[PDB]
């Protein structure tokens, strides 16, 4: 059952947490930003340019 | 400096990695007039009695 | 007698130390699971809550 509560949960605050819906992908791909920012931010000791972590991430960047 | 105690110690380290001068913030600065700087804008911190 | 007085350098570091601590929590969390030898010193503290 964890499965499906874990799945049922994050289903439901992916969908209607936001006032603006966004698509899954999207959130997604937001949380992989933040990820990447973080070390980035000590690594780099300043923090990345938008475009800095535009190569590190796969999209149109 | 990072510790890590063998399992079931008397305390040794198995490793201990020294992650260099993690960078954390970055806290204004005073000038030399006694004023800060944040954005822009000299602001001055007056002291406090309490 | 009874007043006192603080001024700048003192209150930068009482707002420091409760960053300090709202750090501290984070980094429990993350030596709650932690592998050995992957992270280090850096992938834990944070640097915008500071």
Known sequence: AT???????TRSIADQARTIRIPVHMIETINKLNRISRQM?????????PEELAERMLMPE | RLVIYEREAPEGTVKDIKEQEVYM???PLMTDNGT?????????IVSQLH | ???????????????????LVRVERAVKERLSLG?????????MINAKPI
């Not at chain 1, 499906?4 to 949960?9: E, F, L, P, S």
């Not at chain 2, 800060?36 to 001055?44: A, K, L, M, S, W």
């Not at chain 3, 007698?1 to 960053?19: P, T, W």
């Not at chain 3, 592998?35 to 992938?43: F, G």
């Open chain 3, 1 to 19: 007698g009874n007043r006192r007085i603080r001024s700048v350098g003192e209150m930068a570091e009482n707002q420091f130390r409760v960053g």
């Open chain 1, 41 to 49: 931010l000590q690594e780099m000791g300043r923090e990345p340019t």
């Open chain 2, 36 to 44: 800060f700087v944040i954005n822009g804008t000299e602001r001055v």
């Open chain 3, 35 to 43: 592998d050995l030898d992957t992270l280090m010193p850096q992938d």
């Open chain 1, 3 to 9: 499965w499906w509560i874990r799945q049922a949960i």
């Open chain 2, 25 to 27: 913030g970055e806290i």
